[PDB]
Short mmCIF file of C-alpha atoms in Angstrom, two decimals:
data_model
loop_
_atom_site.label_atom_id
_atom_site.label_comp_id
_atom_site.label_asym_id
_atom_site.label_seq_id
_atom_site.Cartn_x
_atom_site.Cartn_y
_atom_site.Cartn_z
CA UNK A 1 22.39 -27.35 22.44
CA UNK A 2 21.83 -23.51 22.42
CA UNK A 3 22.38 -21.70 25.76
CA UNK A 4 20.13 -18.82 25.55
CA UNK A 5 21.39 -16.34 28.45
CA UNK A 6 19.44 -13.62 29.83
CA UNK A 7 20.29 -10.30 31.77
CA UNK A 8 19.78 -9.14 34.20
CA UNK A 9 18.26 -11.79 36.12
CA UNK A 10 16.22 -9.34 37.86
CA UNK A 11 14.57 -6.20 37.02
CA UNK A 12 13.03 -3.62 39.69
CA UNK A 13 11.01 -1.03 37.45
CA UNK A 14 8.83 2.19 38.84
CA UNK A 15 5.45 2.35 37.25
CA UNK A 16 5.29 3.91 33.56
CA UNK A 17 9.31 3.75 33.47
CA UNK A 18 10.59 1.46 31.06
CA UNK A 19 12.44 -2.10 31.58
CA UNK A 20 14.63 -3.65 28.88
CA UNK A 21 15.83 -7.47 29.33
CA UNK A 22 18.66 -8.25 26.91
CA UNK A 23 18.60 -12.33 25.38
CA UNK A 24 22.08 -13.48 24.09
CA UNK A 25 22.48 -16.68 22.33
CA UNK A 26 25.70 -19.11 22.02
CA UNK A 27 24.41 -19.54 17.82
CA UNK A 28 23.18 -17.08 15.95
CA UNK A 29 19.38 -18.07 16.22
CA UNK A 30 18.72 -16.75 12.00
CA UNK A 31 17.23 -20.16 10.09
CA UNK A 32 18.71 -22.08 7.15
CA UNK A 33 15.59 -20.48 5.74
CA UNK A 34 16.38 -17.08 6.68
CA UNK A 35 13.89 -16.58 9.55
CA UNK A 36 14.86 -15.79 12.71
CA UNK A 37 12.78 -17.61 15.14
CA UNK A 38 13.41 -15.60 18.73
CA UNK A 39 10.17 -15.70 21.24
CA UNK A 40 9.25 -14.17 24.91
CA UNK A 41 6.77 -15.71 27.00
CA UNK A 42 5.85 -14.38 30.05
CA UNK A 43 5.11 -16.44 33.04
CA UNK A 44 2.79 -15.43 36.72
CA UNK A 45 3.23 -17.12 39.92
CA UNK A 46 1.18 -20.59 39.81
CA UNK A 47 0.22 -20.47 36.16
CA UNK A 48 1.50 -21.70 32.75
CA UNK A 49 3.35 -19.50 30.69
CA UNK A 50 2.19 -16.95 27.64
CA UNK A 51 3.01 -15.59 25.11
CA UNK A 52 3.66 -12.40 23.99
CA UNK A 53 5.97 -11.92 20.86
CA UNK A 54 7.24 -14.75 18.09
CA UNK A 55 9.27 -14.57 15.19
CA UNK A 56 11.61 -11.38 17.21
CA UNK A 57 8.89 -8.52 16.86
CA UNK A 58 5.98 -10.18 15.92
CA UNK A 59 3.27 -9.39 19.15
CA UNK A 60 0.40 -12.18 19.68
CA UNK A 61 -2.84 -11.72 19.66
CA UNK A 62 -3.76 -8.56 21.90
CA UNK A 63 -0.17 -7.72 22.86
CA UNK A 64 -0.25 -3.99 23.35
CA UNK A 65 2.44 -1.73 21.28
CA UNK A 66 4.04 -0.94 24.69
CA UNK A 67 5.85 -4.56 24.53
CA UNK A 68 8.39 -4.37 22.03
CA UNK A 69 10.77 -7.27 20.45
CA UNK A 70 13.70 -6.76 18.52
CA UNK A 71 17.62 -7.86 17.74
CA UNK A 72 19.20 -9.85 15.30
CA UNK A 73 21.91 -12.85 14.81
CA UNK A 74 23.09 -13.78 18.75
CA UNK A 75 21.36 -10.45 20.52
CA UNK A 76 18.14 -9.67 21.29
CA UNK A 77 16.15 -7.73 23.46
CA UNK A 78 12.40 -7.08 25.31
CA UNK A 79 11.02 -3.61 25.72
CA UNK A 80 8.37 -2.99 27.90
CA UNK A 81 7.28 0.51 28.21
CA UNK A 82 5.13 2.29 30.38
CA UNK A 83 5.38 -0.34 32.98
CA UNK A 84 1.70 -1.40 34.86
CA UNK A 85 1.70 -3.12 38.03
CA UNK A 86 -0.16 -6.70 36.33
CA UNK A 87 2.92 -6.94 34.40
CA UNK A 88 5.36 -8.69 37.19
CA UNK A 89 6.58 -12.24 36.66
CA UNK A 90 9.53 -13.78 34.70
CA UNK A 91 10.06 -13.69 31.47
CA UNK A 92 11.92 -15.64 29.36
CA UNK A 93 12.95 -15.41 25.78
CA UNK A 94 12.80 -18.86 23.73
CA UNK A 95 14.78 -20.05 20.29
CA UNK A 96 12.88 -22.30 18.20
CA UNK A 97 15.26 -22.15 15.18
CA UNK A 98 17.70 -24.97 16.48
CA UNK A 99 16.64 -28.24 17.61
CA UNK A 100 16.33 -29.15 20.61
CA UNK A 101 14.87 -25.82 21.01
CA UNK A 102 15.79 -23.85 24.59
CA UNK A 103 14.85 -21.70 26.72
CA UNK A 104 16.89 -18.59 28.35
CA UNK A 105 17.18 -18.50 31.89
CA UNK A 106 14.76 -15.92 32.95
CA UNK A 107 13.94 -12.94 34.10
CA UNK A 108 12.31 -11.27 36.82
CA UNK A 109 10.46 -8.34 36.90
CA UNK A 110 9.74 -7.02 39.88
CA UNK A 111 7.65 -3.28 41.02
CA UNK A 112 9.15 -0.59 42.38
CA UNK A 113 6.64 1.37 44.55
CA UNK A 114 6.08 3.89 47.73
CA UNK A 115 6.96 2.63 50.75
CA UNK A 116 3.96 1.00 53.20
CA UNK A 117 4.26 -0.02 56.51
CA UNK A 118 2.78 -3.58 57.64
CA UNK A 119 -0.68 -3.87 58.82
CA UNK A 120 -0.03 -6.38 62.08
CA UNK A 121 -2.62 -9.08 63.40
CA UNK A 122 -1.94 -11.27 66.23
CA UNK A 123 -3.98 -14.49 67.01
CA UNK A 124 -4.32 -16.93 69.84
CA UNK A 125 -4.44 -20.12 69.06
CA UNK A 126 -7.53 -21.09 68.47
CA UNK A 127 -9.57 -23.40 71.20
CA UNK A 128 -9.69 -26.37 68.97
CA UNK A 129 -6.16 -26.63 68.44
CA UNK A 130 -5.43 -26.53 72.02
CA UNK A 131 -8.34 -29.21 72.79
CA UNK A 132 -6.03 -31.39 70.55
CA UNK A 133 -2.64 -30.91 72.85
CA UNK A 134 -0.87 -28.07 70.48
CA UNK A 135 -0.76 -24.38 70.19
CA UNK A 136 0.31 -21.60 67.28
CA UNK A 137 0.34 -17.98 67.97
CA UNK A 138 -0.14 -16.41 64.41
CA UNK A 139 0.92 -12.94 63.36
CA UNK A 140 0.28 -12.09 60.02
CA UNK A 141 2.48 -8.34 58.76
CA UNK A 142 0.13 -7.65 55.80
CA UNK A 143 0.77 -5.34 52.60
CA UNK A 144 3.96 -3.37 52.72
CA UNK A 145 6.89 -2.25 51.11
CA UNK A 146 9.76 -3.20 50.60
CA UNK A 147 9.54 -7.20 50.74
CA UNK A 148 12.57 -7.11 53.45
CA UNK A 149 11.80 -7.12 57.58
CA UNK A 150 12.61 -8.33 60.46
CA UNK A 151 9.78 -10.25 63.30
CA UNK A 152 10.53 -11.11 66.43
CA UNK A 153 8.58 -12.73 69.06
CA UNK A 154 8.60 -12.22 72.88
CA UNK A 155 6.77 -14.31 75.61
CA UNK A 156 6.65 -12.43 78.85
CA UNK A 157 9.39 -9.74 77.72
CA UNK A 158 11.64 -12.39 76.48
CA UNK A 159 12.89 -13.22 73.29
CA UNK A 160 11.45 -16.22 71.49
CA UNK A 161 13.73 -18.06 69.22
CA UNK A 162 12.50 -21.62 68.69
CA UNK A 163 9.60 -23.18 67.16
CA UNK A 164 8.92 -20.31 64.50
CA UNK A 165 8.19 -20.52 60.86
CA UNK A 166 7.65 -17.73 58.51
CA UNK A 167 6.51 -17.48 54.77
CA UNK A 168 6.29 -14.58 52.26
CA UNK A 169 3.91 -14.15 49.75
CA UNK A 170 4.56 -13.33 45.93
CA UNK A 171 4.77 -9.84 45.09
CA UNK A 172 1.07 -8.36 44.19
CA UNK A 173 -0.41 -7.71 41.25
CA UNK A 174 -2.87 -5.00 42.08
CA UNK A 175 -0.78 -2.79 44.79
CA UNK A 176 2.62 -4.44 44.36
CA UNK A 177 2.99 -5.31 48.17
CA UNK A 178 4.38 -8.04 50.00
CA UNK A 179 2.88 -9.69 53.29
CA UNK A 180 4.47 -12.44 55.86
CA UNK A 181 3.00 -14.74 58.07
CA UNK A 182 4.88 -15.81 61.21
CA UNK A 183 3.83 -18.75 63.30
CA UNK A 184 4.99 -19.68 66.29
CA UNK A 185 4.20 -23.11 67.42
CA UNK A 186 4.69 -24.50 71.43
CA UNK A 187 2.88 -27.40 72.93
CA UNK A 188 -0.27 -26.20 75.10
CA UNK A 189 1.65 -27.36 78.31
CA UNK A 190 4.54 -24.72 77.64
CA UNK A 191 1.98 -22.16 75.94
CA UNK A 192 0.42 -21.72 79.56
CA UNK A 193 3.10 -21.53 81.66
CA UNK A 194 3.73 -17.85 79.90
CA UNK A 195 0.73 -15.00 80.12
CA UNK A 196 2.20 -12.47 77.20
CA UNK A 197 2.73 -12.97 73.88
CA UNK A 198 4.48 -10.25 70.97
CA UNK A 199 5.29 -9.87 67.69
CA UNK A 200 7.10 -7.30 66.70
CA UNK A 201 7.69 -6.23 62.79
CA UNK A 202 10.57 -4.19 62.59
CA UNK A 203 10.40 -2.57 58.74
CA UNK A 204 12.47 0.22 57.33
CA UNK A 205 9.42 2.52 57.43
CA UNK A 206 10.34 3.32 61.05
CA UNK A 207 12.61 3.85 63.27
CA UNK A 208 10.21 1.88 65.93
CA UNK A 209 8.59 -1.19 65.64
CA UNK A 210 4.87 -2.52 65.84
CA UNK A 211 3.96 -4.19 68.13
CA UNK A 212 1.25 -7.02 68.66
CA UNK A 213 0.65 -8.44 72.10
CA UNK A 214 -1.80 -10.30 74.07
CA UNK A 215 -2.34 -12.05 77.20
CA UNK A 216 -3.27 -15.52 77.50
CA UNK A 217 -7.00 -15.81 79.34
CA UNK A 218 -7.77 -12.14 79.16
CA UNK B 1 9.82 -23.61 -9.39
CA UNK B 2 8.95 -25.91 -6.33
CA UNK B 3 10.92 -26.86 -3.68
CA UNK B 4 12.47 -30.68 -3.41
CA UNK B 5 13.27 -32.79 -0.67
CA UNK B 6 15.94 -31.42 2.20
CA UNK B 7 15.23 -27.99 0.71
CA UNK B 8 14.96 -25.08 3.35
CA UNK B 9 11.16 -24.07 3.07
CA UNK B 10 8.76 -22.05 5.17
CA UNK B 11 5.88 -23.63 6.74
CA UNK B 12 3.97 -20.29 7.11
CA UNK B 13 4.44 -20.26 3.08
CA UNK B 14 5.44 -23.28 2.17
CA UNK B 15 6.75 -23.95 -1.19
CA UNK B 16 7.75 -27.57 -1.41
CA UNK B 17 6.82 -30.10 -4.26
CA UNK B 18 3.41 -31.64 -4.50
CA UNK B 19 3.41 -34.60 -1.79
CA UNK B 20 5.83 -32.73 0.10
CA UNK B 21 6.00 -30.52 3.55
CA UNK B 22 7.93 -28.45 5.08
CA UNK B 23 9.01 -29.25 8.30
CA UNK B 24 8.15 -27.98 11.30
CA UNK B 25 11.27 -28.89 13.63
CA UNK B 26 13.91 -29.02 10.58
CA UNK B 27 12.10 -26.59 7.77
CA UNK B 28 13.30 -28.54 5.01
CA UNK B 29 10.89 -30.01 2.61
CA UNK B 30 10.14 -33.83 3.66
CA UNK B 31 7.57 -36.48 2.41
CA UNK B 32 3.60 -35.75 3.85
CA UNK B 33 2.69 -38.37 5.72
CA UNK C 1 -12.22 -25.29 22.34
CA UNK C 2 -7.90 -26.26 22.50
CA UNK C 3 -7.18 -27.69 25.91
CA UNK C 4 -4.41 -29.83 27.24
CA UNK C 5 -5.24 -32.12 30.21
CA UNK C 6 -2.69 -33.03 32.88
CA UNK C 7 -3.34 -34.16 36.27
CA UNK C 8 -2.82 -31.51 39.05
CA UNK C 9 0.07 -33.26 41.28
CA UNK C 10 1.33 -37.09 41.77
CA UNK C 11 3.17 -38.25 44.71
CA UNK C 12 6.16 -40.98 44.06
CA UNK C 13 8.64 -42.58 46.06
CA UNK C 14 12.44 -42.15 45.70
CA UNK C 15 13.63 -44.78 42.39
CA UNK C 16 9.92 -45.28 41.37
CA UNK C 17 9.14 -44.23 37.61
CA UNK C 18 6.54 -42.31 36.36
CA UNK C 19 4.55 -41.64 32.98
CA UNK C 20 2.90 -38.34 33.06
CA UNK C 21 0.20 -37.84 30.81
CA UNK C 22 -0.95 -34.91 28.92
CA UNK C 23 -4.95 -36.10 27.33
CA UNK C 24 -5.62 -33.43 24.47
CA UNK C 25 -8.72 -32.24 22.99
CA UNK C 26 -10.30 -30.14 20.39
CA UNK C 27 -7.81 -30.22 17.34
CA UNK C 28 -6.27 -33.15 14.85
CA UNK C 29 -3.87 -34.25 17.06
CA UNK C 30 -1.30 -36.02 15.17
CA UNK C 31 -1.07 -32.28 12.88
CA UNK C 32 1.01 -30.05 15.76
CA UNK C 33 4.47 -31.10 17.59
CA UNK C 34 3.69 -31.45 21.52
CA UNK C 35 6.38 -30.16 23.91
CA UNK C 36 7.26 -30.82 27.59
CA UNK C 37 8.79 -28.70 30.16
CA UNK C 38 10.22 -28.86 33.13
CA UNK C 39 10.48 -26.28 36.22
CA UNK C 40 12.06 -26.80 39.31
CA UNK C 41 10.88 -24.23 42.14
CA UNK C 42 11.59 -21.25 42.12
CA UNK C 43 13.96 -21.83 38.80
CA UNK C 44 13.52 -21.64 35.05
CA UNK C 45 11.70 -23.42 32.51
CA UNK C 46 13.60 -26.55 30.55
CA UNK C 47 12.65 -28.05 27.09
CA UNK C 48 12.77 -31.39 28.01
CA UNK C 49 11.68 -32.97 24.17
CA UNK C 50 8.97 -32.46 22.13
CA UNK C 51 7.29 -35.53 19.55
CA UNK C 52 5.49 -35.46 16.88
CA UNK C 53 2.30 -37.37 17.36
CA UNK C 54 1.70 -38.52 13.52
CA UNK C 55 5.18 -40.44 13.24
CA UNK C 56 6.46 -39.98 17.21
CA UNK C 57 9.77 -38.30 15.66
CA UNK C 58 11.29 -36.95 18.77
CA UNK C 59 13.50 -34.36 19.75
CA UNK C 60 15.26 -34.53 23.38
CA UNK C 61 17.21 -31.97 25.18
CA UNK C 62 20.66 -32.97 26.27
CA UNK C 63 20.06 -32.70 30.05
CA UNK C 64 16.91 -35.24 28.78
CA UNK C 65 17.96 -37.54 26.75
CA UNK C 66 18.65 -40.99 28.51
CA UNK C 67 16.28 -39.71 31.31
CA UNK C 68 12.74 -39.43 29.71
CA UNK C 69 11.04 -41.01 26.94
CA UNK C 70 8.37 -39.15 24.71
CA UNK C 71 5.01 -41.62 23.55
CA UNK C 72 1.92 -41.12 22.08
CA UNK C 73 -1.27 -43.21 22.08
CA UNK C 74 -3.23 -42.13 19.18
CA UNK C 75 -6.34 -43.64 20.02
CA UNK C 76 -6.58 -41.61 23.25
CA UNK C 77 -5.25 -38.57 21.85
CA UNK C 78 -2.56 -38.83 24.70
CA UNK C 79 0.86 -37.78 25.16
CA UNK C 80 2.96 -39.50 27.82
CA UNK C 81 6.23 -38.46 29.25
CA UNK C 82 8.28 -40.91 31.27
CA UNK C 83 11.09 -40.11 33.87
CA UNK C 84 12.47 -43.45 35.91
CA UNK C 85 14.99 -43.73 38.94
CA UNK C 86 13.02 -40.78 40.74
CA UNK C 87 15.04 -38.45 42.96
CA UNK C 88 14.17 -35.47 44.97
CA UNK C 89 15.28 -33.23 42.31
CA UNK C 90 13.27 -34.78 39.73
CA UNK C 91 10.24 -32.73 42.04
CA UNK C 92 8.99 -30.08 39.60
CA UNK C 93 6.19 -29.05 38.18
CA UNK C 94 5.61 -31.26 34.14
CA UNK C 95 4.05 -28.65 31.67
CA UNK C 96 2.98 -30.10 28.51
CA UNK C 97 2.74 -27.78 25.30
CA UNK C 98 1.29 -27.38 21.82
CA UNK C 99 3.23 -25.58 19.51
CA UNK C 100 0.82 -23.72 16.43
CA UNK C 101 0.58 -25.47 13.60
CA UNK C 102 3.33 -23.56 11.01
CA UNK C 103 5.98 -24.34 13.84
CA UNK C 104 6.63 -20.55 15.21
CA UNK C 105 4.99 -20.67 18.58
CA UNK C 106 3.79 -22.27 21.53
CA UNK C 107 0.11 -21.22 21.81
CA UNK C 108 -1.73 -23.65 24.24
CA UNK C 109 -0.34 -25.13 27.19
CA UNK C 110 -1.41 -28.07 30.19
CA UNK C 111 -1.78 -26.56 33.46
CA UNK C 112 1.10 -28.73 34.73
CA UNK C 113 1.84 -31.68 36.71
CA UNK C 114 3.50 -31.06 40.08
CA UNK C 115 5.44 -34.20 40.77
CA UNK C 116 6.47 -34.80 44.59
CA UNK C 117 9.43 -37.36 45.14
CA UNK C 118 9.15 -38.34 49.07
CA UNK C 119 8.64 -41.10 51.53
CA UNK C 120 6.78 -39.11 53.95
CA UNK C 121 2.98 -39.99 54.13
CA UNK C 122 -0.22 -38.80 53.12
CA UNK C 123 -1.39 -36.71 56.29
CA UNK C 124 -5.32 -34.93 56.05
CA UNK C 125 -4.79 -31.30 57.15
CA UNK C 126 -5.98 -30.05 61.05
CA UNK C 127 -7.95 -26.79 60.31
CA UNK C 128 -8.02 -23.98 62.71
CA UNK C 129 -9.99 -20.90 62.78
CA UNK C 130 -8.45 -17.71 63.65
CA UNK C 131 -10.83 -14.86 65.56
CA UNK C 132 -9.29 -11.76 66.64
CA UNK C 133 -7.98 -11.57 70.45
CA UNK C 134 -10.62 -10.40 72.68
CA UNK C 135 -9.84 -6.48 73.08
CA UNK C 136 -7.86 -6.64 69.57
CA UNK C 137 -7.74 -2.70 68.75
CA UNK C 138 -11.31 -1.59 67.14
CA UNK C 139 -10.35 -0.21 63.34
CA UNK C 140 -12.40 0.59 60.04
CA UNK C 141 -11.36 -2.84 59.11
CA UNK C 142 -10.99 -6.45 60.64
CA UNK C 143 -8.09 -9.55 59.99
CA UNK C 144 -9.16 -12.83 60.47
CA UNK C 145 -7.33 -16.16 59.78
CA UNK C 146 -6.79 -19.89 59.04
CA UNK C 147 -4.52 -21.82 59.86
CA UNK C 148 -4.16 -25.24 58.00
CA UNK C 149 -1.67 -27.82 60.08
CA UNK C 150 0.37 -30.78 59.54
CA UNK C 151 -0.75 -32.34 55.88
CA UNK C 152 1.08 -33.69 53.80
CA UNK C 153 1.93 -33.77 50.23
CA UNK C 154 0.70 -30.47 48.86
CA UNK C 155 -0.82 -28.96 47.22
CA UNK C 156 -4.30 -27.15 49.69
CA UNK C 157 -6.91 -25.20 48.04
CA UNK C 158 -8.07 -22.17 50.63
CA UNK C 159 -10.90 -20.51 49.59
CA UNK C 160 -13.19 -17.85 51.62
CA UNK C 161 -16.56 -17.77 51.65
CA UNK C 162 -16.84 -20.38 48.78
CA UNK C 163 -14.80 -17.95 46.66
CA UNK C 164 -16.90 -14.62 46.83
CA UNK C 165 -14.04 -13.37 49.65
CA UNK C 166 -11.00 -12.78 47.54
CA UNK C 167 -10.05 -9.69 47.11
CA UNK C 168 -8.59 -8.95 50.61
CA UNK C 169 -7.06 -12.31 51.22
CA UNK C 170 -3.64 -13.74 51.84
CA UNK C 171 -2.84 -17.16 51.20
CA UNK C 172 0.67 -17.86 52.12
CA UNK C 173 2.95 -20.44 50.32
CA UNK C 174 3.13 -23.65 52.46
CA UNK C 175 6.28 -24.38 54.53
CA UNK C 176 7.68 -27.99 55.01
CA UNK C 177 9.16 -29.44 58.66
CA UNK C 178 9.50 -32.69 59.63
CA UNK C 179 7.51 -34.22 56.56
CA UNK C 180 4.37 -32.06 57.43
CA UNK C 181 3.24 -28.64 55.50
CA UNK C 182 1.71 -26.12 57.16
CA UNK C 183 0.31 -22.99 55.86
CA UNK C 184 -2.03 -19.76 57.01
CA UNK C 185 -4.14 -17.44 55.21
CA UNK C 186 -5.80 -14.05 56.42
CA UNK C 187 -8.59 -12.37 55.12
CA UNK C 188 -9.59 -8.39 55.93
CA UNK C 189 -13.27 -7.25 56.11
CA UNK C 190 -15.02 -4.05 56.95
CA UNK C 191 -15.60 -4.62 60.71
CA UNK C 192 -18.94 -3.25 60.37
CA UNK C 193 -19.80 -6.56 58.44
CA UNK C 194 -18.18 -8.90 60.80
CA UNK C 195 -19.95 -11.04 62.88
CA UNK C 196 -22.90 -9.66 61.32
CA UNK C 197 -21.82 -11.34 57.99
CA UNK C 198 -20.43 -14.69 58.33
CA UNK C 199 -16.77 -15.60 56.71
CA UNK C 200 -16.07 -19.31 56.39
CA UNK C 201 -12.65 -20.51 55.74
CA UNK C 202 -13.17 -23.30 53.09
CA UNK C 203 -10.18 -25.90 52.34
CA UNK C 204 -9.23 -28.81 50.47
CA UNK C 205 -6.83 -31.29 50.38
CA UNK C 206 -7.45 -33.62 47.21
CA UNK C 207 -4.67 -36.06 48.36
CA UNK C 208 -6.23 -37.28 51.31
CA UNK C 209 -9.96 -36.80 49.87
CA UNK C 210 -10.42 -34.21 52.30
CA UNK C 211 -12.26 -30.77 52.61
CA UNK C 212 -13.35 -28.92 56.24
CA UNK C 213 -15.32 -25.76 56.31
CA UNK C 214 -14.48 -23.53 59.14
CA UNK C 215 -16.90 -20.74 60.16
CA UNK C 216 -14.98 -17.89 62.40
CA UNK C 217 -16.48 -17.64 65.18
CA UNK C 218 -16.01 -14.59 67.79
CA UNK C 219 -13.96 -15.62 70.98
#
């Protein structure tokens, strides 16, 4: 079949700059018939994919100027100019000349933006959990930028290593920020043999860290 | 003139004989079913 | 209206089989090719075949072609899509597609099947609302949370406030350990609306037939 190969495989573009994603295929994708039948879809976190040109430089239906197909033969390439912060998410191009028709591999467009420090929130566990024998201290580090940092938890000045899982949201499409939740999970019986609890989010955006603590029955 | 059977055609302007199609997955003309 | 009707997520058992459907409406149905696709997370999309509906001539992708099997069942309007000998990477989400009727694009699409290939069990979700520590620092604006514990398979809907909350919430992808999901979400409010204003976390877990409401309540 046609491998359709696309670079890079990710993209990190400033607002209103331009990003350019180059689709190379292992066939020239030009039809018996003379057509050249290239297409880019573009695809959000969660939701089917769309598209946005057909036919190499043909744009669908609402598909402003600022998106831009073109190439010929094996090479082809996406322009988007005048990047806007709704337009992360992969996109792929598509040939629909050869059957079986293929997909490339994808690309990833990502935002590049100011940098923001994480807004911290640290949570208890909450009284019916620990009615039922458990008990999660939550610590959400909300909005900032960039997407990498480190947490760390510390019960009664010591370092907490065990029993901790974290997850990272998507990228967003309005303020282009990332946000992690960290949850640390002990049974109640070990949960009150300690009185403080930290998190600590330690993020490029200083030199210190913030820091989240409470005491258990304050 | 029209286009016969295994021709290349177009489907977006599709010239094949009378009781034929073009394709959609080969674009050649073929019998309409 | 053009719509393409697949069932949000199935859960199978390692070297079951399964036949996805894909129920279309509003167009001739036998007059446009339909496509599948596969996507693995976190990875790209894969033509697995595509069929025509009039005559079922079909089309298969190598990586596809003594794996699945293409149908149709005109009198339903259905397409089907069958994968056998289930294994954990066979776990993706199923798109089915239309492509337009001169053969140049894909224009409508199913929302997607997300097949799960497990033995773990069905588990309802333990739903936990999160209030702020007592003497949490006073700002213009308020976190609170929800934690949802120990279900299993996904996926769980998390709404706030029936849906009218959205803007300032956080829903954070599910993580898996020992055969049980758990995920949070936060929500941020002007503190001069909270308690005053209630916020309910609201979730769902269609698998085990299950949805809990969970006011916050000040500690």
């Amino acid at each position: 079949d046609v491998l359709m190969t696309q670079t890079p495989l990710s993209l990190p573009v400033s607002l209103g700059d331009q990003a350019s994603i180059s689709c190379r295929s292992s066939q020239s994708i030009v039809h018996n018939n003379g057509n050249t039948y290239i297409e880019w879809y573009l695809q959000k976190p969660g939701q089917s994919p769309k598209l946005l040109i057909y036919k190499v430089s043909n744009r669908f239906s609402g598909v402003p100027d600022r998106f831009s197909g073109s190439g010929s033969g094996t090479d082809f390439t996406l322009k988007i100019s005048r990047v806007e912060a709704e337009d992360l998410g992969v996109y792929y191009c598509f040939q629909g000349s050869h059957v079986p028709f293929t997909f490339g591999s994808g690309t990833k467009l990502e935002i590049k933006r100011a940098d923001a420090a994480p807004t911290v929130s640290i949570f208890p566990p909450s009284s019916e959990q620990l009615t039922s024998g458990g008990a999660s201290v939550v610590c959400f580090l909300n909005n900032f930028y960039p997407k990498d940092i480190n947490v760390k938890w510390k019960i009664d000045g010591s370092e907490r290593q065990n029993g901790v899982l974290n997850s990272w949201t998507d990228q967003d499409s309005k303020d282009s920020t990332y946000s992690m939740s960290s949850t640390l999970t002990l049974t109640k019986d070990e949960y009150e043999r300690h009185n403080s609890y930290t998190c600590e989010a330690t993020h490029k955006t200083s030199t210190s860290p913030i820091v989240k603590s409470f005491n258990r029955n304050e | 003139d029209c286009l016969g059977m295994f021709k290349s055609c177009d489907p977006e302007n599709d010239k094949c004989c009378k009781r034929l199609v073009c394709s959609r997955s080969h674009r050649w003309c073929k019998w309409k079913l | 209206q053009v719509q393409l009707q697949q069932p949000g997520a199935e859960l199978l058992r390692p070297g079951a089989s399964v036949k996805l459907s894909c129920k279309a409406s509003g167009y001739t149905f036998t007059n446009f090719w339909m496509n599948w696709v596969k996507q693995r997370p976190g990875q790209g999309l894969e033509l697995i075949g595509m069929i025509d509906p009039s005559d079922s001539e079909t089309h298969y992708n190598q990586m596809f072609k003594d794996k699945a099997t293409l149908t149709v069942d005109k009198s339903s309007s259905t397409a089907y899509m069958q994968l056998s000998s289930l294994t954990s990477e066979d776990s993706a989400v199923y798109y089915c597609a239309r492509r337009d009727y001169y053969g140049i694009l894909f224009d409508y699409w199913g929302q997607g099947t997300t097949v799960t290939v497990s033995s773990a069990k069905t588990t309802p979700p333990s739903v936990y609302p999160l209030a702020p520590g007592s003497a949490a620092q006073t700002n213009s604006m308020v976190t609170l949370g929800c934690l949802v514990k120990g279900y299993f398979p996904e996926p769980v809907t998390v709404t706030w406030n029936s849906g009218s909350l959205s803007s300032g919430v956080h829903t954070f992808p599910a993580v898996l350990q020992s055969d049980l999901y758990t995920l949070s979400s936060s929500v941020t409010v002007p503190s001069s609306t909270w308690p005053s204003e209630t916020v309910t976390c609201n979730v769902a877990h269609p698998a085990s037939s299950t949805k809990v409401d969970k006011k916050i309540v000040p500690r």
